[PDB]
Structures are given as C-alpha cells and as structure tokens.
Motif scaffolding. Structure first.
Motif, mmCIF file in Angstrom:
data_model
loop_
_atom_site.group_PDB
_atom_site.id
_atom_site.type_symbol
_atom_site.label_atom_id
_atom_site.label_comp_id
_atom_site.label_asym_id
_atom_site.label_seq_id
_atom_site.Cartn_x
_atom_site.Cartn_y
_atom_site.Cartn_z
ATOM 1 N N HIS A 21 0.850 -1.173 0.000
ATOM 2 C CA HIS A 21 0.000 0.000 0.000
ATOM 3 C C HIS A 21 0.903 1.248 0.000
ATOM 4 N N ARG A 24 2.832 1.938 -3.245
ATOM 5 C CA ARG A 24 1.966 1.846 -4.405
ATOM 6 C C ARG A 24 2.426 0.821 -5.443
ATOM 7 N N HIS A 122 1.029 10.233 1.987
ATOM 8 C CA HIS A 122 0.095 10.022 0.920
ATOM 9 C C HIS A 122 -0.793 11.213 0.678
ATOM 10 N N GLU A 125 -4.899 10.070 -1.744
ATOM 11 C CA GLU A 125 -6.175 9.585 -1.189
ATOM 12 C C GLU A 125 -7.011 10.811 -0.770
ATOM 13 N N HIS A 129 -2.061 12.251 4.715
ATOM 14 C CA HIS A 129 -1.707 11.469 5.906
ATOM 15 C C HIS A 129 -0.352 10.778 5.730
ATOM 16 N N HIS A 131 1.904 7.280 6.924
ATOM 17 C CA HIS A 131 2.019 5.982 7.616
ATOM 18 C C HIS A 131 3.443 5.964 8.116
HETATM 19 MN MN LIG Z 1 -2.525 5.725 2.869
#
Ligand SMILES: [Mn+2]
Length: 192
Positions: A21, A24, A122, A125, A129, A131
């Motif tokens: 994720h 990508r 990211h 989306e 945010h 991660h």
């Molecule tokens: Mn994300």
DNA sequence: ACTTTAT
DNA sequence: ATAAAGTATAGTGTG
C-alpha cells in the motif's frame, strides 16, 4: 481541527501488505492514480528493501539477547498521522511537508531516530496522511509492550498535539477519555 | 494479569 | 522451568 494519531501493530505477516500500500505496488476506488507521483517518503530508506527485511536486519544486528525474534513479534508500530480536510486546506505544499516532518521529529526525539523505519506521506487519497513505522526497539530489546503501553498512549494524545502547536500547527488534542471505538477504513466508509 | 514463545 | 514479550491501550477520520 483534531490531531489524528493512532498506531497499528505490525507483525511479519502484515508488513508485506503495509509495504504494498505504502509504496503503491499495485487499485482502490479512493486512490487517485494521477496524484500518486505527489507522494513522498520522509526517511533515507531503500525502496527495493521490504519493511520486514529492513526491520529484522536492524533488530537482529542490534539486539542484546541471543534468542531469535519471536514469530509473533510486533516488528513495528505503524502510526497514522493526519487531521481533517479543513486543517490541510489551509496549508501550502511546504507547510504540509513540514507538518509531517514535524510529527516524525516528535517520534525520533522521543523513541529514537534510528527507529523510524519508514515515513510515507500520501497525498493521492482523500486527505493528506503519513504511515510512519516506529520500531519499538530500546535498550537492546524489541518490545511494543514496553514502548507503547496504556500510560504512554495517554501521554502521546496529550503531548503530541501540544508539540505540533508549539511548532506552528493549529490543531487540538482529541477528547480526553474519548469513548469512540476505532473503525476500520472500510468500516468508517460504510458509516458515511 | 493471563498466555505464548524460544530458549 | 524461565522470563521476555505476546494480548490492549488512546485518539479521529473516508488512513
Ligand atoms: Mn494511505
């Protein structure tokens, strides 16, 4: 706006999914592929090295004990760092970058710079945010149990929003003793 | 505070 | 047989 900070425990078995994720390497109806070139990674890490490999090598090389890392070990704590859309709409590109770099600084200074394994931002989306994978490695031992316990998570919810506003960001802490239950992303979406 | 884990 | 770390935790949003 509220500061959003929460961790998810990552074992060996779900780090592949996290990497897939975050980097990508696949898509989901809520990811704009046209905006993916816009994402960035805040650490010096090698993109061709899995998180599972990176963290295991680091821990295995640094640990005091001779015992193997347990198969159910929490290899890292992935913190989501975010806020609401309104908070982000106020910020240019440079400020948005500083915001995440600032959040990363908090965890570097508090839990060890060399423990921030990835910090993936990211923008493709719904809302910006990050991660961020924090390795719970301290004093030669790997233990999420020791690093992020009840008192520690209470402390973060008070201290991290404070640290961010000390650094220029207009957001407040979440409701103290909040009674909300985490919903999954997919479950939050059903709710809306 | 109760299990699971790798010795 | 032993002891460290597993299990949750604290927070809001379309991660
Ligand atoms: Mn994300």
């Amino acid at each position: 706006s509220y500061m959003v900070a929460r961790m998810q425990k990552m074992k060996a078995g779900n780090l592949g999914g996290a990497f897939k994720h975050n980097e990508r390497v696949f898509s989901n109806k809520d990811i704009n592929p046209s905006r993916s070139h816009l994402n960035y990674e805040l650490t010096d890490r090698d993109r061709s090295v899995s998180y599972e490999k990176q963290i295991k090598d680091y821990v295995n090389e640094n640990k005091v004990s001779n015992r193997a890392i347990r198969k159910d070990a929490v290899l890292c704590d992935e913190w989501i760092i975010t806020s609401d859309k309104d908070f982000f709409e106020k910020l240019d590109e440079e400020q948005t970058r500083t915001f995440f770099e600032t959040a990363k600084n908090y965890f570097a200074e508090n839990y060890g710079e060399s423990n921030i394994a990835y910090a993936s931002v990211h923008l493709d989306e719904s809302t910006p945010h990050m991660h961020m994978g924090v390795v719970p490695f301290e004093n030669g031992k790997l233990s999420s149990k020791a690093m992020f316990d009840r008192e520690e998570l209470k402390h973060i919810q008070e201290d991290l929003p404070r640290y961010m506003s000390d650094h220029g960001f207009e957001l407040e802490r979440g409701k103290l003793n909040s009674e909300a239950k985490h919903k999954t992303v997919a479950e939050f979406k059903r709710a809306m």
